Amino acid sequence: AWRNATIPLFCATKNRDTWGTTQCLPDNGDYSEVALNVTESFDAWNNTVTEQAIEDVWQLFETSIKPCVKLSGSGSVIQESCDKHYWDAIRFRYCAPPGYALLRCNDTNYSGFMPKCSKVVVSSCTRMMETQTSTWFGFNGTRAENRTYIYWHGRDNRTIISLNKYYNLTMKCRRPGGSRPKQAWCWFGGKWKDAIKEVKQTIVKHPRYTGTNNTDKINLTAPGGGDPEVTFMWTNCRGEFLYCKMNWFLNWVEDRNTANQKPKEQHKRNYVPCHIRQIINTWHKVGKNVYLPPREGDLTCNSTVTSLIANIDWIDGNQTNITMSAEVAELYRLELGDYKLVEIT
């Protein structure tokens, strides 16, 4: 017997354990779950498990790539020791403290908001979750399956879309070595054109979607302006923060008619130019961080592309925009949004 609960969870790792305020324990290796004969409500956003995950990823973010100067929007200028030694993005799992348990909605119908799940399973700890931080797309995620599915905010049109494992989507980024210390390429591999078609078909079928059913009027949409982490895709490779201009990729994946575009942006390519920045806007707190000049050598990173962060925007039945999002936190609501913490009592 139980009741919904809000209490700090304990984290568990396989290798390294300390970062900022966070300290994890060793992973026990048990990923088993037990089926229950009960109906429960689940919600990926109104969720202490994902709320805590967002905070710990933030703690990880500032200790894995060490900033030299922290500039808060308040006006404080804080200097710190910095070098080019960076921690790779880790995986960790959460574990319920004694007297508590973790429920999970084990249902393909789960879309991030489910007032009645009757395929509940219980366990003491969660799956391992990916902690990398990015905008537009999610990389190296743990939730990809042989299907496309959407976590759709129950009270908003915020979404995060899980891309189909079948299409083998990847991204290879490379900043070649020298003897261009601040500019690179990112190559998009896999069957991207079919994966996006399936995203749009999935949206059309969804009960929450009341927009056009003409998939030629459903379009991935770059934000018109704002911070660079919003107008460019934001990612990191070898401890360097990358900002990628995505016009050519959007032209290519949707096979757009580009005649109405400036000549430099008319190209349709599955690779995009990226540049390295030393000043970034922080994603969880208002501020700016300053980092050291980029390292030397050949920088290469190969990732799976597992999710697409977006708002589904329409005001009538004639056009729908899948507007690419810089809401980094949605990544972790996909990673653990099917869990609920309850007090065994």
Epitope: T39, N109, Y110, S111, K116, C117, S118, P207, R208, T210
Partner: antibody, heavy 126, light 108 residues
Framework: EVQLVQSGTEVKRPGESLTISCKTS????????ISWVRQMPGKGLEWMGS????????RYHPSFQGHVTISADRSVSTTYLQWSSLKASDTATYYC???????????????????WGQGALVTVSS | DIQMTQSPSSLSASVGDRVTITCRAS??????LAWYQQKPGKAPKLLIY???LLQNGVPSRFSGGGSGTDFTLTISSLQPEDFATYYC?????????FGQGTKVEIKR
């Protein structure tokens, strides 16, 4: 395959009690709404009510509230429709109807019926 | 309590004709409308849901459209098996209600 198999024809008199049933198979009985639908002779379809077997949540059309009781038994994957005191006007065909299952959780937006029972003829007369 | 008004109550057509039925809601139901087919002595069969989505197995000659209050069902080329009665149903407002039916019979 999903199957909704209803009990057979019924002939009763005004004032008697009646329970008709519908046994399901081929899907998780507890995780989907299942409804009862009346079709009077030569007329259209009227939704009477529904139950979510997984937690016994029920809904009734305002015209049938208080005149019928809908229930379910998960151990035998069966839903029941019961009258306490039949009237002649209750003569009709009654359908078991399952709500669309793959609704992404939004049963209040997709409350339509993809699988139906064969129907049960119920005659009430002196 | 939303009322569904189907037009016309009856309609005659021949194999191969293009037929369209109408359904109107007493108030707006967005895109959440379903269409069923019923033949004498048999249970209803679902054809379309959410106004334009075809249930698995339904032949492609069936199509649905509309949003708000005015909806239509269209059969592009009538076949022998398509002569039956058709009901609409709003499926997002408790209590759920059906149209009173539109019968499609053969012409001669």
């Amino acid at each position: 395959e999903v199957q909704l198999v209803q009990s057979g024809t019924e002939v009763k008199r005004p004032g008697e009690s009646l329970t008709i049933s519908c046994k399901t198979s081929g899907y998780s009985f507890s995780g989907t709404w299942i409804s009862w639908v009346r079709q009077m002779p030569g007329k259209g379809l009227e939704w009477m009510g529904s139950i979510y077997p997984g937690d016994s949540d029920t809904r009734y059309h305002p015209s049938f509230q208080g005149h019928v009781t809908i229930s379910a038994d998960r151990s035998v994957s069966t839903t029941y429709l019961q009258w306490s005191s039949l009237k002649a006007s209750d003569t009709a065909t009654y359908y078991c109807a399952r709500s669309y299952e793959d609704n992404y959780g939004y049963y209040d937006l997709f409350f339509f019926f993809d699988y139906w029972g064969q129907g049960a003829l119920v005659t009430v007369s002196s | 309590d939303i009322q569904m008004t189907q037009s016309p109550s009856s309609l005659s057509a021949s194999v191969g004709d293009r037929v369209t039925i109408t359904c109107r809601a007493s108030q707006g139901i967005s895109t959440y409308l379903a269409w069923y087919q019923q033949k004498p002595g048999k249970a209803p069969k679902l054809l379309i849901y959410k106004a334009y989505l075809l249930q698995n197995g339904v032949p492609s000659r069936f199509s649905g459209g509309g949003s708000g209050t005015d909806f239509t069902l269209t059969i592009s080329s009538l076949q022998p098996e398509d002569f039956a009665t058709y009901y609409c149903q709003q499926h997002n407002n408790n209590p759920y209600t059906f149209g009173q039916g539109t019968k499609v019979e053969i012409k001669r």
